[PDB]
Write a protein that holds these residues in place. Structure first.
Motif, PDB file in Angstrom:
ATOM      1  N   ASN A   1     -11.020  -5.870  -3.213  1.00 46.32           N
ATOM      2  CA  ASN A   1     -11.719  -4.737  -2.619  1.00 46.32           C
ATOM      3  C   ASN A   1     -10.890  -3.467  -2.605  1.00 46.32           C
TER       4      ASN A   1
ATOM      5  N   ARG B   1       6.812   8.561   1.969  1.00 46.72           N
ATOM      6  CA  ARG B   1       6.463   7.143   1.947  1.00 46.72           C
ATOM      7  C   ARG B   1       5.427   6.889   0.861  1.00 46.72           C
ATOM      8  N   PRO B   2       5.682   5.892  -0.001  1.00 43.22           N
ATOM      9  CA  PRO B   2       4.755   5.537  -1.085  1.00 43.22           C
ATOM     10  C   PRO B   2       3.400   5.048  -0.563  1.00 43.22           C
ATOM     11  N   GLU B   3       2.314   5.399  -1.250  1.00 40.59           N
ATOM     12  CA  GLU B   3       0.999   4.859  -0.914  1.00 40.59           C
ATOM     13  C   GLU B   3       0.844   3.445  -1.456  1.00 40.59           C
ATOM     14  N   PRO B   4       0.196   2.567  -0.680  1.00 43.13           N
ATOM     15  CA  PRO B   4      -0.138   1.213  -1.127  1.00 43.13           C
ATOM     16  C   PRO B   4      -1.137   1.266  -2.279  1.00 43.13           C
ATOM     17  N   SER B   5      -1.084   0.298  -3.190  1.00 46.42           N
ATOM     18  CA  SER B   5      -2.085   0.217  -4.252  1.00 46.42           C
ATOM     19  C   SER B   5      -3.457  -0.022  -3.635  1.00 46.42           C
ATOM     20  N   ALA B   6      -4.497   0.480  -4.287  1.00 40.23           N
ATOM     21  CA  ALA B   6      -5.830   0.486  -3.698  1.00 40.23           C
ATOM     22  C   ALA B   6      -6.367  -0.910  -3.437  1.00 40.23           C
ATOM     23  N   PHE B   7      -5.879  -1.887  -4.191  1.00 45.61           N
ATOM     24  CA  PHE B   7      -6.419  -3.236  -4.107  1.00 45.61           C
ATOM     25  C   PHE B   7      -5.567  -4.213  -3.303  1.00 45.61           C
ATOM     26  N   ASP B   8      -4.378  -3.784  -2.884  1.00 48.84           N
ATOM     27  CA  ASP B   8      -3.473  -4.646  -2.120  1.00 48.84           C
ATOM     28  C   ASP B   8      -4.054  -4.890  -0.738  1.00 48.84           C
ATOM     29  N   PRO B   9      -4.135  -6.168  -0.334  1.00 46.94           N
ATOM     30  CA  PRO B   9      -4.649  -6.578   0.979  1.00 46.94           C
ATOM     31  C   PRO B   9      -3.756  -6.082   2.114  1.00 46.94           C
ATOM     32  N   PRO B  10      -4.344  -5.818   3.288  1.00 47.79           N
ATOM     33  CA  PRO B  10      -3.617  -5.312   4.460  1.00 47.79           C
ATOM     34  C   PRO B  10      -2.527  -6.264   4.957  1.00 47.79           C
ATOM     35  N   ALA B  11      -1.427  -5.705   5.448  1.00 45.94           N
ATOM     36  CA  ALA B  11      -0.458  -6.451   6.247  1.00 45.94           C
ATOM     37  C   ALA B  11      -0.920  -6.347   7.701  1.00 45.94           C
ATOM     38  N   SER B  12      -0.253  -7.036   8.622  1.00 48.00           N
ATOM     39  CA  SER B  12      -0.833  -7.202   9.955  1.00 48.00           C
ATOM     40  C   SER B  12      -0.388  -6.248  11.079  1.00 48.00           C
ATOM     41  N   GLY B  13       0.913  -6.112  11.311  1.00 49.20           N
ATOM     42  CA  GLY B  13       1.379  -5.384  12.483  1.00 49.20           C
ATOM     43  C   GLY B  13       1.311  -3.868  12.396  1.00 49.20           C
ATOM     44  N   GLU B  14       1.520  -3.214  13.539  1.00 50.35           N
ATOM     45  CA  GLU B  14       1.597  -1.756  13.632  1.00 50.35           C
ATOM     46  C   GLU B  14       3.033  -1.370  13.923  1.00 50.35           C
TER      47      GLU B  14
ATOM     48  N   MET C   1       5.533   1.207  15.848  1.00 49.31           N
ATOM     49  CA  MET C   1       5.386   1.866  17.151  1.00 49.31           C
ATOM     50  C   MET C   1       6.620   2.693  17.458  1.00 49.31           C
TER      51      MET C   1
ATOM     52  N   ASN D   1      -2.774  -0.123   3.990  1.00 48.84           N
ATOM     53  CA  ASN D   1      -4.073  -0.775   3.999  1.00 48.84           C
ATOM     54  C   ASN D   1      -4.285  -1.503   5.305  1.00 48.84           C
TER      55      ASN D   1
ATOM     56  N   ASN E   1      -9.653   0.116  -1.157  1.00 44.12           N
ATOM     57  CA  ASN E   1      -9.449   0.602   0.208  1.00 44.12           C
ATOM     58  C   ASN E   1     -10.128   1.925   0.560  1.00 44.12           C
TER      59      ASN E   1
END
Lengths: 99, 49, 50
Positions: free
Chosen positions: A62, C27-40, C42, B28, A64
């Motif tokens: 998908n 900071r580099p942008e993530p690739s459009a298709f790479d799934p999210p990582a979890s934490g934030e 702070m 993402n 983003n």
């Protein structure tokens, strides 16, 4: 592997060529600040007809930003209609309407 | 004891549709789109009750 | 290196702290298709002045 124009232009008429075609849907984007590289990629030899008549699905990832990736293809409904064995023994798709 | 649900909260059926990937500040996020208003919420914090 | 709130809250008044602040412009942008990582990420401690 690659195919020279020298052979595409001078081979016996019965030869079976094997062309390769990248699907570039999932090529990574360059970082916004990375400086340009120099050359251009080029394609000299093209199909006259669609390739990938066999394709059923494409780009199961998908995006983003946009809700579905450009050019992503869902499987056809017929891949999934088990339907019924008719009394004759022929398979059938499910009826689209009552009666 | 079962905690009572507070007066401001909106009921929401879970669905796979509610969560998605999305760009947000150079990563993402696991965005939660919110059915009453449709606002996307990339961060786990700051979401509506 | 990092600075605990435990020290920011309980140190002699004359201590010289050394906070670090990332500038995230590049900071580099993530690739459009790479799934999210979890934490934030702070930040608990902020400057009062530029």
């Amino acid at each position: 592997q690659h195919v020279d124009a020298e052979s595409i232009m001078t081979a016996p008429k019965g030869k079976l060529f094997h062309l390769q075609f990248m699907d570039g849907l999932l090529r990574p984007e360059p970082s916004a600040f990375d400086p340009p590289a120099s050359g251009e990629d080029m394609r000299l030899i093209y199909p006259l007809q669609p390739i990938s008549v066999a394709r059923s699905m494409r780009a199961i990832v998908n995006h983003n930003e946009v809700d579905r990736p450009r050019g992503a293809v869902a499987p056809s409904s017929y891949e999934m209609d088990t339907g019924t064995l008719s009394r004759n023994g022929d398979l059938l798709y499910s009826p689209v309407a009552n009666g | 004891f079962v905690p009572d649900v507070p007066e401001g909260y909106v009921a929401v059926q879970y669905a796979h549709r509610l969560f998605s990937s999305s760009l947000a500040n150079k990563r993402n996020r696991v965005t939660y789109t919110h059915p009453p208003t449709g606002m996307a919420y990339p961060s786990p914090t700051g979401r509506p009750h």
